[PDB]
């Protein structure tokens, strides 16, 4: 029962380990262990429940333990001290093979093999802690211990890839406990958390690890918005060291989401549009990605209303995520028709939903767009239209008030109109024949460059597998 289960689960762990162990120590095959590690987290999360969970303790004992016996003890203590011959020496399956850590030599300290093993062991504890949902004591105990250990290491390109993943867990775990309960102690430790990412990012730029650079930047941009600091976020993005060389599309998609938010509040809805479209493209469409797609659609719709444009009606409809976007359709109806009352009623009703994501705050500003949008439409239908007509239609308070709103608009040039005070009408200036002017050329010049950039992307990537095969023997 217990003995069988502990050991069998442990067997699989060592097979996975051997593969990653062998590959890092024979040249730098850097990319290949990384693909294994992705698959590893998934396989491990599913494992843990089946075949007991003190399978990890056996593993600790079995190999060399420099601090990890104490860590594993601490976890065991937390959920009640468990006993079944779980005293050290319980497991020992090294047996003098150099691939399973030569038993005499390692212990004497005539050879060291602990380095990379320790980083991996830690990876299993953070994963398992998070799995189980052991918070409070352990969360602080864990951060306290892992950060000085990496900073005592001088981490290879390979070892850089491993610790990019502990970093993820360090950030999330501090957040969940904070969200669970507010306390000043949570607040003191928050300052500690920012400072550690900033010190490490410089180290990781010098090793130029595409994995490591990517993970850290996504976390930091997120932290900053949560504390609302505009200023720090703009400086942090200026550098743009955020790679696109090899990193996953999931990593990028996060990166693009944050930029959209950031640019939107700074009043650039032009560039926010491009980012938010770009964030959807990179993201895979998966169920495991559903949370991201759901937040992405919502942000897209807010940007289109901030610009002054109505997004496609069909977006909200044809979605199978249509239920969440119930608040979005009511906002879209109110904006397009210029109904002053409707708009205010909508945001009262869906307020608490909207407050969750702090889209409430954007919607206070979307009050302005109700009016802006409606005037653009009235002007496109009716070229010369007395100021008197406009007010009657959309119940605007007076001729003096609407004149001024229109006046403001055409400074920023959205309406593309002009007021003729003396004659009492507002006259749209549009006339077409912009094909004759130089503007299509500017447009088309860019479109050529985009195709060329496609070709290059094709060419470079294409040759990288072929190298492998020519070098490999073939039948």
């Amino acid at each position: 029962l217990h003995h069988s289960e502990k050991k069998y689960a442990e067997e699989d762990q060592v097979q996975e380990l051997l593969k990653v162990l062998n590959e890092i120590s024979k040249t730098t095959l850097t990319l290949d262990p990384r693909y294994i590690w992705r698959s590893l987290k998934d396989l491990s999360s599913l494992r843990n429940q089946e075949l007991l969970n003190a399978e990890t303790l056996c593993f600790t004992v079995n190999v060399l333990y420099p601090d990890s016996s104490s860590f594993k003890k601490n976890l065991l203590k937390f959920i009640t001290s468990n006993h079944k011959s779980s005293v050290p020496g319980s497991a020992e399956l090294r047996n003098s093979y150099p691939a399973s850590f030569y038993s005499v030599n390692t212990e004497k300290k005539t050879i060291e093999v602990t380095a990379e093993i320790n980083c991996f062991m830690h990876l299993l504890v953070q994963l398992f802690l998070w799995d189980s949902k052991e918070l409070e004591q352990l969360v602080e105990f864990n951060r306290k211990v892992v950060i000085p250990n990496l900073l005592c290491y001088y981490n290879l390109r390979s070892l850089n890839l491993i610790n990019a993943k502990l970093w993820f867990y360090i950030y999330l775990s501090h957040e969940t406990l904070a969200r669970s309960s507010e306390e000043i102690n949570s607040d003191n430790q928050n300052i500690i958390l920012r400072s550690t990412m900033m010190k490490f990012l410089k180290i990781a730029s010098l090793k130029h690890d595409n994995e490591t650079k990517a993970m850290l930047i996504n976390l930091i941009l997120r932290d900053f918005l949560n504390n609302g600091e505009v200023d720090s976020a703009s400086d942090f993005i200026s550098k743009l060291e955020y790679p696109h060389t090899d990193v996953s599309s999931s990593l990028e998609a996060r990166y693009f989401f944050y930029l959209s938010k950031i640019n939107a509040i700074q009043l650039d809805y032009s560039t926010a549009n491009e980012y938010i479209i770009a964030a959807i493209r990179k993201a895979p469409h998966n169920s495991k990605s559903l949370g991201f797609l759901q937040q992405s659609n919502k942000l897209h719709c807010c940007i289109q209303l901030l610009m002054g444009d109505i997004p496609e009606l069909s977006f909200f409809h044809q979605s199978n995520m249509q239920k969440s976007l119930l608040p979005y359709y009511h906002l879209t109806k109110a904006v397009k028709l210029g109904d002053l009352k409707k708009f205010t009623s909508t945001i009262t009703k869906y307020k608490q939903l909207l407050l969750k994501d702090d889209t409430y705050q954007l919607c206070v500003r979307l009050r302005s767009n109700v009016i802006k949008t409606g005037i653009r439409i009235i002007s496109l239908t009716y070229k010369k239209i007395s100021l008197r007509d406009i007010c009657l239609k959309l119940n605007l308070d007076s001729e003096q008030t609407v004149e001024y709103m229109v006046s403001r608009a055409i400074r920023d040039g959205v309406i593309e109109a002009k007021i003729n005070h003396e004659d009492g009408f507002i006259e749209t200036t549009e006339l077409l024949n912009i094909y004759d002017s130089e503007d299509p050329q500017q447009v088309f010049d860019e479109r050529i460059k985009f195709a060329n950039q496609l070709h290059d992307e094709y060419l470079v990537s294409m040759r990288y597998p072929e190298d492998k095969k020519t070098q490999q023997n073939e039948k």
């Binding site: 300052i191 010190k199 730029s205 200023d231 720090s232 942090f236 550098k239 060291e241």
Partner: protein
């Protein structure tokens, strides 16, 4: 905590306040640097002037920030 108190103190004209501020920033320069990147041209001006006597320290701060950002050339 934030750099906002720290910034505020540079501005105070009185000599002793500016000097104290330099020490304060220096502690947290390695810990936090992205927030005072904005305000680099001021730290630089203090280094230029030859009224300060912790003048050597003022340039040290500029240098430290610049290496963390990754503009290594500006640092050296």
């Amino acid at each position: 905590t934030t750099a906002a108190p720290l910034l505020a103190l540079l501005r105070e004209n009185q000599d002793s306040v500016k000097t104290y501020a330099l020490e304060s920033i220096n502690n947290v320069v390695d810990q936090l640097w992205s927030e005072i990147s904005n305000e680099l041209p001021d730290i630089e001006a203090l280094y230029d002037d030859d009224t300060f006597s912790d003048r050597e320290m003022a340039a040290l701060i500029a240098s430290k920030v610049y290496y963390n950002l990754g503009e290594y050339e500006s640092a050296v």
